Design a protein around this ligand. Structure first.
Ligand SMILES: COc1cccc(Oc2ccc3c(c2)S(=O)(=O)NCN3C2CC2)c1
Ligand SMILES: N[C@@H](CCC(=O)O)C(=O)O
Ligand SMILES: N[C@@H](CCC(=O)O)C(=O)O
Ligand SMILES: [Zn+2]
Ligand SMILES: [Zn+2]
Ligand SMILES: [Zn+2]
Ligand SMILES: [Zn+2]
Ligand SMILES: [Zn+2]
Ligand SMILES: [Zn+2]
Ligand SMILES: [Zn+2]
Ligand SMILES: [Zn+2]
Ligand SMILES: [Zn+2]
Lengths: 261, 259
């Protein structure tokens, strides 16, 4: 009893969560729009709770600091009791599954390569066998951890280069990585999840593209604190929304119906 | 320590009898993707296991009258097996009665045709009658069409449920054989994983057409509340991140390709 408003942590990442044009004249959840905003409303309706969308303070997805062992990002918000649920493009990983709970995945993705159109790169192998074109990943994300922990020859070779490249090839936000690709005249390639790659490919000035296949296969899941009673209902809601076609409808809405290319 | 009873199903390339199975015993009789996966799961979770083929040869559905589950799902629900390692699709109705690990393989419903059949999509199938089409019985694909309100898929279900003779088959092998002997007058709706495998096997006379109708995955299943669920789930995530699952897929789908 005593129903409480569910605190939802999320992250400003297009097209998942974006500020509306007139957000300063709106209140509460009405300030935001996007895929995860639509998904949050549906999860809440089917689970029967009220909620409040909050943007993660440090703007990070979630990683454990090697020195302090403290989790940052949305994962930290769940681990340390600042939020009840995370509805965001948060990647299911083993290290995260040990400290938080994930629903079954609501979106599939893989690590992919973003290039400026015309860049002579077709695969991760191509990137690893050359030096003219620099490449990097997002900081404090699952893509960086993938390369740091990989024992696969090609990916290990890529990590050896990235960790020691100077100036740093890592970026603080996805928008920073895309801008770097666009302004580097083809001398920077960005490693990011296929979902964000495919979205940017459909946005003006339509000068980037996804090349090659995905480097791995994984999914985004809705996250709750370990043992939270909310996890069960949220998981069943994700499965219901997928089977009813809602997740496919939302992706088409925010990726391709709004495409500008 | 108890030997874990694993329920599975004879379905290529997931679980197959070895060519020399007759002179082998126990788990050594079988080979395939899920046989390799079971060995890895058991290794990382630290248990011994016995592979057993589901008695009724079904994946799992609930009888509308008696409400009794059949197939591998029933074996878990009624205590005859400790874990199911098979191409078992994660679905809402199943998640209510059994536990699933995070998915170890992705797939979608797809269309298998005899090469040359004038069909390009599910929409094409729905707007005609010359070419019959159906699904596997007691599986998640049949439930998908039964429970779907999407116009095209609802229209397809109305035809399939009333089609005479029955368009449903008892096994995937029966559906594939029906496509191959129909001279292009039967199309089979099945999961993309099995479709893509058959496409690369002799006599190389079928193909997958169109995109997938949905997006879902296979999970390792355990009885609700089973102590194995936690370790199995972490094992799947570790095997994926290590690249083992991608290695096994290439081993059994495309390294085995004969077309
Ligand atoms: C290691 O192999 C992997 C990794 C990651 C996902 C996967 O297979 C999927 C893909 C999608 C998917 C499911 C399972 S599900 O059935 O868990 N939920 C419904 N969704 C769709 C809404 C996205 C297989
Ligand atoms: N989705 C990733 C962030 C983006 C990336 O790492 O490429 C995560 O959950 O950490
Ligand atoms: N993988 C399906 C069986 C095959 C199908 O229905 O197409 C299931 O778990 O029911
Ligand atoms: Zn709804
Ligand atoms: Zn090359
Ligand atoms: Zn493309
Ligand atoms: Zn191993
Ligand atoms: Zn292990
Ligand atoms: Zn009956
Ligand atoms: Zn039947
Ligand atoms: Zn209907
Ligand atoms: Zn094809």
């Amino acid at each position: 009893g005593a129903n409480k408003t569910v605190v939802v942590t999320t992250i400003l990442e297009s097209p998942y969560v974006m500020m509306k044009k007139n957000h300063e004249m709106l209140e509460g959840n009405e300030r935001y729009e996007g895929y995860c905003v639509d998904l949050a409303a549906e999860i809440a309706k089917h689970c029967g709770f009220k909620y409040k969308l909050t943007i993660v303070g440090d703007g990070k997805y979630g990683a454990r600091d090697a020195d302090t062992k403290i989790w940052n990002g949305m994962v930290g918000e769940l681990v340390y009791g600042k939020a009840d649920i995370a509805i965001a493009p948060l990647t299911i990983t083993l290290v995260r599954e040990e400290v938080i709970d994930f629903s079954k995945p609501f979106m599939s993705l893989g690590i992919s390569i973003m290039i400026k159109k015309g860049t002579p790169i077709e695969s991760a192998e191509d990137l690893s066998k050359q030096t003219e074109i620099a490449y990097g990943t997002l900081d404090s994300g699952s893509t960086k951890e993938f390369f740091r922990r990989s024992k696969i020859a090609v990916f290990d070779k890529m990590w050896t280069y990235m960790r020691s490249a100077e100036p740093s090839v890592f970026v603080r936000t996805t928008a920073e990585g895309v801008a770097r690709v666009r302004k580097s005249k083809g001398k920077y390639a960005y490693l990011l999840e296929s979902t964000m790659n495919e979205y940017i490919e459909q946005r003006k000035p339509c000068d980037t593209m996804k090349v090659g296949g995905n480097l791995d296969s994984k999914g985004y899941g809705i996250a709750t604190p370990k043992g939270s009673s909310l996890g069960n209902a949220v998981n069943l809601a994700v499965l219901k929304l997928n089977e009813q076609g809602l997740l496919d409808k939302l992706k088409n809405k925010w990726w391709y119906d709004k495409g500008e290319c």
